[PDB]
Amino acid sequence: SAVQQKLAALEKSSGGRLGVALIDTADNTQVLYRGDERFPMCSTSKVMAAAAVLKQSETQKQLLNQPVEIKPADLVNYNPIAEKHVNGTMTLAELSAAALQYSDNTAMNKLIAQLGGPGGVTAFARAIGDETFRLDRTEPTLNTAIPGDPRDTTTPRAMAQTLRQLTLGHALGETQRAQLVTWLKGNTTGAASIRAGLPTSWTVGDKTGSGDYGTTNDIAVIWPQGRAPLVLVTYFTQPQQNAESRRDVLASAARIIAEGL
Numbered sequence: 215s216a217v218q219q220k221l222a223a224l225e226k227s228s229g230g231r232l233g234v235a236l237i238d239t240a241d242n243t244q245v246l247y248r249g250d251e252r253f254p255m256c257s258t259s260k261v262m263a264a265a266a267v268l269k270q271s272e273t274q275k276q277l278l279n280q281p282v283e284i285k286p287a288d289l290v291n292y293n294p295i296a297e298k299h300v301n302g303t304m305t306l307a308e309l310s311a312a313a314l315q316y317s318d319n320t321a322m323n324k325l326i327a328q329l330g331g332p333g334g335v336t337a338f339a340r341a342i343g344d345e346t347f348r349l350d351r352t353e354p355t356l357n358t359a360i361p362g363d364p365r366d367t368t369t370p371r372a373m374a375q376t377l378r379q380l381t382l383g384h385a386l387g388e389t390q391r392a393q394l395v396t397w398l399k400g401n402t403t404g405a406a407s408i409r410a411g412l413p414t415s416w417t418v419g420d421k422t423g424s425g426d427y428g429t430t431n432d433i434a435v436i437w438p439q440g441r442a443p444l445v446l447v448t449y450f451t452q453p454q455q456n457a458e459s460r461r462d463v464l465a466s467a468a469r470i471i472a473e474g475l
């Protein structure tokens with residue numbers, strides 16, 4: 215298709231490896247580019263950890279208000295929100311918001327701990343029918359993004375389907391789903407990624423990811439004004455370990471997808 219030729223050209227121009235999955239919920243049609251190749255998730259994995267905690271809260275009704283102590287030892291490499299609460303507490307709701315909206319790595323590690331380790335995050339993925347997602351490590355080492363390493367990867371197709379289920383489907387309870395959507399819509403890190411390739415009138419909720427090997431990711435739910443929502447996953451990684459982030463590639467892929475409808 216025209217869109218796949220343009221995505222392939224974008225990829226060729228970029229020097230890296232691009233993975234795209236679009237789901238149009240209007241007719242359940244899919245557009246895939248390297249849709250079944252594995253990519254390092256980096257912080258896009260935080261959506262799964264937050265959703266897993268939300269699932270727990272369907273039975274433990276007060277779970278999200280549980281306070282969790284932030285100690286100096288908990289701080290890792292990127293903790294914009296947790297740093298503000300060292301020697302204090304944050305609720306699991308505040309940690310979920312911080313992980314999603316600021317990509318806080320300490321918050322992610324607390325969510326992983328709440329789930330019993332990376333295996334508990336992966337278990338949630340399996341429980342909602344995602345056989346591809348795997349979380350193997352905690353922050354910050356899950357971002358090493360080593361070529362060929364299957365740890366902490368998923369495929370664009372799998373992540374698109376899972377994000378659809380979590381946000382637009384009913385993998386979560388009604389209140390939990392709405393909370394996740396609210397959190398994603400309030401993301402603060404996504405202005406230069408998928409959002410930048412789309413009409414300004416469209417509502418977007420997204421989660422970015424960045425890691426070594428210039429890994430630059432964004433996963434989004436998109437609500438166009440007067441039109442069925444779309445799920446768009448854009449993963450990008452590069453051959454040099456110290457490569458710079460390329461958020462412009464994700465914006466461009468989004469623009470190409472948006473043009474083609």
Ligand SMILES: *[B@@]1([O])O[C][C]([C][O])O1
Binds near residue numbers: 256292317357
């Ligand atoms: B994710 O990818 O978003 C930011 C942090 C940086 O360690 O991880």
